[model samples]
Target chain A: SQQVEWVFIPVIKDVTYEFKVDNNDNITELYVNGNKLGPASSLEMDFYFDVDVSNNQVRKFNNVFVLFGVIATKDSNKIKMQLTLNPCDFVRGFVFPSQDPSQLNNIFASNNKVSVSEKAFAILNRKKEGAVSSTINVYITQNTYTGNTKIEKIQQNTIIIEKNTGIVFKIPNDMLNIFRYSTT
Target chain B: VEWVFIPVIKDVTYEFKVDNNDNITELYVNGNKLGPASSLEMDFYFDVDVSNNQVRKFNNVFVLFGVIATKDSNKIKMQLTLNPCDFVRGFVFPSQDPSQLNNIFASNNKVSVSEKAFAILNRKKEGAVSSTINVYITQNTYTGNTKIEKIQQNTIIIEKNTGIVFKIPNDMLNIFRYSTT
Candidate 1:
């Protein structure tokens, strides 16, 4: 008999994450670097990353947190990554404007900015203690990207972006619905 | 840059049960009960016999799923019985056939009766709204002892005796990636 396969196409570079789903196509577990992460009910989606360059520990990012962008140097161990909260509205504005027009209204109206900062600090502290690298820097931003930002490729696995830009990396909107197996 | 693929198994048998009075009571998957069948509707997919420049229903089968009911009733029961031996192997769409409709296949070309019909939601539009969905009926064979009138809304219908098909629209069904093999 033939079987159906669900694949995850990552949007970030050098980030590793795995997901488990039940028979009904519901995601049951998420893992990164052999560490179980989350299904945080507060976020629209959940993900994990190995931002630190030293060890194999994976960091979790539920809805309130997201991997906005990554920057890696070619000749050095320097790596920079950004995190945010509730990036759906910003993303949808570009790919699927009709999905939820007012998503940003409710997002900014809430306390997500404060939550994003807290999560970003916690991740930075964890990475600093792990001593992944002496040149690692993490930043926190709002839920949207602006025109002042530009994406530049410094190396095969490295990217460069302006500081304080709200740009976030993500997969295509169509891929989000691939697991919705329905006939009716 | 490494990638991981999760293979989803789709070859599980579904067993349905009805009360003594013929009201659907329960549904099971591989012997494990899924849930109550009080408000459930079932749809079947079949293969297209594209022979002699004519698009007819074939013996091949594809996939099936449960659809939401239009009306709520606790005494609902399927009045039709499909031939267990006529199971085929292949997936056919309404557009591939001469009808050019946008719907999946039914259980078989020949159904025992046409007294009862089931409603299925039209999944033709991208990111479509459920309220704007067009509902179509998978009526029993057209050439049964009991003949039913075909729907007029660019709908598609199947012939029981000859397995011939017809439809009102050219793009009526949305073909999915599920393999008929």
Candidate 2:
């Protein structure tokens, strides 16, 4: 009984990590989705965007940071994968979409923006045909890049994005909950 | 100059607007210009008049309709959730124990958990005004447009008859071919 997959990572470009077993033949937490990423730190994914020629001149990456960095040892059997990320995390959007009823008090006045439910006047009186899905609180600060460039692969249903190169970033998801509390 | 590749028609509901000149250059489907016209939204392409586009589609899984405007110019519309590793690309498990593995999945690492019928969208809760959206399920229906039932209300876990089957080549189905009509 054997089966495993990560789409093969002989990874030479942007080498991730392989310290050959550091001191913590141990534990490091961060599994996410512990019911709203633990007491709501921040994660409002999906602002929609796809149009990045990787780079050479094309823009649009919105957000897709599904980071991964695991190294099990404390008798958790096994699960070593120090890193497998950048699957796409170009967060840089300030919320947009409208059906203007005269910009509803400058879009919620000063809470940035947030509408789509509570009906919001029934999507402005029985929806005016699409355009309603909003939110605002973007301030990623750093390590955010969508300059463009992706080289991905996934056989069986075929997905081989290869176009140039340059696409990988590390250490930043608000410092990963301080590395998820560095063990107690 | 003839290049092509814009066929990401997984499920549907391609409403436009996120920055505007009357909402991301007006373009709609299931709502035409759900429709627009923003500096032409970065100059669009591929227009074959499927009755002037906005062809009508609300299949399922579609949330990323964000909009933010308020420096004194109300323009709000939001419903975000997109990132299951972006259409998810990882799946294959059944190596109980190659004796506490670390040898790269400890058994010939090769994943494939996408037999199709996905719905990835996770966490986002904002209280005092109302907001909560938690999703990302893994299901059945070999890619018939992600809808075994993802339009009603469901956000939880799934197993769906063990994983280890793959398929995604129909000559790439001519880029989902939908130039018109």
Candidate 3:
């Protein structure tokens, strides 16, 4: 239904337009090519969103799509465009890659050995650095391993190394946590 | 008691803003130094295994740690804890039709079907028509305390009458099998 007075615009690459919505969440502003298009209107469009669950952060819409232009009852316009606007529904769906919405890191870490598949969050800190710093080997293997000691998971206040594969770490105190861990 | 100064951008990041004396690491997000890591029997580790370890604003980052019983004197044992990872093996199935991917969802167990639909049941499969779909996931060696999980194995056969059939490894009533604990 034509609730707005006018619609239809050209979309050029390498340009960004400002869109405004009402307190009721109605589209009221769309500026294209320095031409303003609304104070009391709304948007009519379709959207399909895609996300990469690997890099982990799914926002900053790099691969969202939308129909090219705005249209009205007396007229029609169409084009396919790659848009970079934040949508509530699609963005909210896969914001974090886990079952729990409250936690940023879901996988637990322990003081002993840890193995991962695909990838996971990290663990940090060593109990005592006997020979300078310990070594974390970068290994690739199809070899099978056994034995599951099933250590209890760590709490949030343990320890973490902000840096890399090499470093001298702070000693562990019952009152202070310092060391390194890895994530994928 | 010791005071550890905060590591400036060049000084390596430290939680404390003073010097250390009691052989204990003091932490201060706001500044009241507390010694926690210094009281442990071992050092600490963060699977700081990222491209880098910088958890800035809006980054979904959390930390959880615990103690593990290590053999060989606490040598960090490496285990590959694979999640349910799987791959499909393909088999030859003589067939023909211009294939296009289709997405369908059903509910209530009673679904209306199209004349061109091949299976009375909807299952996730991927392959060319002339072949069979064999997908496998989660072949892990971590034998620990696992609950009894029922795994279903199905053998699907299609006859020349254009009908579908399924065969379970066991009797139809007791076809489910349990996973190794």
Q: Residue by residue across A127-166, what tens digits does model 3's lDDT show?
A: 1112111111111122211111111222332222111222
lDDT rank order:
1, 2, 3
Instruction: Tell me the tens digit of each residue's lDDT in model 1 across A1-184.
Output: 0011111112233323344434333344443323343332311112222222233222332221112221111112111222111111111000011122222222222222211111111121122122111111122122222112223311132111111223323333333321111000
Per-residue CA lDDT of candidate 1, range B61-177, in tens? 332211111111211111111111111111211211212121122222211111111112232221211111111222221111211111123222333323333331433222211
Stretches > 4 Å off in candidate 2: A1-184, B1-26, B32-35, B38-43, B47-85, B88-181
Which structure among the candidates has the greatest DockQ?
A: 3
Candidate 3, residue A86: the lDDT equals: 10
Model 2 lDDT tens row, A42-146: 111112222232342213323222212111111121111221112222111122222222322221212222111211111111212222232222111111121
The 10 consecutive residues of candidate 2 chain A with the worst lDDT sum are A1-10
What would the per-residue lDDT of candidate 2 be over residues B65-121, giving only the tens digit for each residue? 111111111111111222222232111111233222222211222221111122222
TM-score of 3: 0.14
DockQ of each: 0.01, 0.01, 0.04
Docking class of 3: incorrect
Better of 1 and 2 by lDDT: 1
Give each model a TM-score: 0.18, 0.18, 0.14
